[PDB]
Symmetry: C2
Subunit: 254 residues, 2 copies
């Protein structure tokens, strides 16, 4: 119904206006801070180095940015058999970190066709893992559900206890335990690790934090595909969690 479509639209538009105001309240002071810091650092380089013109400076910065955009650090491979495999995975899962992206015209063309047919192909694997996890957790939850049924507990509370039991159990295995590993391996903060997990498993994938992206960290070859395996089982868990939040939002709608 169009009447209900307009209602959800008004809620979403308000939710975005609200979100945007909270984000600028938390981010605009830091943005202004970095805007002034680069203004000062560029101005002090032209003071200290008189043999450098303001135009020659901008040309160098542009050359450094062009290199960084291409996935090459302008300080001091991303397409190796393993790193390219994980890139492909990032496209198929719709995460799209963008820390690396195709620069070649042909690379962009192949990326279009690869995503179009690859994303539905993953959909089957994600639905398959989703059904398997629903059988593993489903059998474990039923064992607990039978215990409360004997205790004359209401059908309401049992379903509530089960929903909190599944979320809490999976949150340990797919969110907490991997974030502890990323905090130690990648060397991020407790917040930045949880932030990476949520941003990854929601398929948002900003690319500010990417597992196995540090030049200084020389971790073994098994880490990159193991991260992709965590993603595979973690996306199925998060899909169920986001579906339950949707289900609870439908309850609040009625």
């Amino acid at each position: 119904k169009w009447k209900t479509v307009v209602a959800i639209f008004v809620v979403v538009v308000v939710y975005l206006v609200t979100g945007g105001l909270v984000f600028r309240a938390l981010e605009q002071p830091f943005e202004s801070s970095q805007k002034n810091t680069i203004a000062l650092e560029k101005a002090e380089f032209l003071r200290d180095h008189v043999c450098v013109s303001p135009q020659e400076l901008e040309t160098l910065i542009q050359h450094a940015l062009d290199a960084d955009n291409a996935g090459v650090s302008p300080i001091g491979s991303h397409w190796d058999l393993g790193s390219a495999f994980f890139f492909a995975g990032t496209v198929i899962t719709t995460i799209g970190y963008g820390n690396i992206a195709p620069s070649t015209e042909g690379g962009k063309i192949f990326c279009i066709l690869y995503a179009i047919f690859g994303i539905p192909l993953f959909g089957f694997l994600l639905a398959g893992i989703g059904d398997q996890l629903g059988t593993i957790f489903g059998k474990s939850i039923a064992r607990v559900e039978k215990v409360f049924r004997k205790k004359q507990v209401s059908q309401t509370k049992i379903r509530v206890i089960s929903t909190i039991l599944f979320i809490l159990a999976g949150c340990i295995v797919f969110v907490t335990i991997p974030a502890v590993i990323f905090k130690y391996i990648e060397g991020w903060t407790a917040l930045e690790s949880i932030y990476f997990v949520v941003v990854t498993l929601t398929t948002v994938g900003f690319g500010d934090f990417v597992a196995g992206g540090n030049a200084g960290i020389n971790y073994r070859e098994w880490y990159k595909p193991l991260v992709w395996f965590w993603i595979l089982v973690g996306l199925a868990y998060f899909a169920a969690v986001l579906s339950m939040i949707g289900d609870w939002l439908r309850v609040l709608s009625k």
Copy 2:
């Protein structure tokens, strides 16, 4: 069934190995080219400018990168967190596109983004399902008018919907982004596909240029296109999924 789950896994693993080899065949020679280009550009700067030491060169390059990571161009008044630009950022999280050209740098901004995504993505799901049902009624009533003419079929209707929607949601907006943002014909189509599949690399982001001073009607209209375009692409990717299930 687990027997079919392992089968799809083997297909996906092969598809990734294949994909990775095609991507490196197209990208690794250019990567090596840019690796040598920055090496020579830095070496030429230190030759032409003797008053600059190799240490103070890396320090500025580092300062420039730090600024770019924070979403501030180290080139050359404009903001990324203004009422309108922050609204589009919120939209990017909710649609799961996540361009990442801008992302929260604050610990609090990161905390709020976790909660915002968790409750916001399902909220969008309803709006996307609602637009999906409405488009299915608009395109469904228009296809039935043509279907009645030939009766006096399902394959002919699928080709008609894909071609019609591809003009309205992919072709026409790509032409606008090529003129407004100033991208190539390829880069505009590439941006549209990367955006409407919710991949969102962030290499190309509408309303991201510092030099381009587009009005307050540009940034929200882009999200309005994202809103109706995601519903179209969701149906297209569902049909490709349906077609693959037939081949299975």
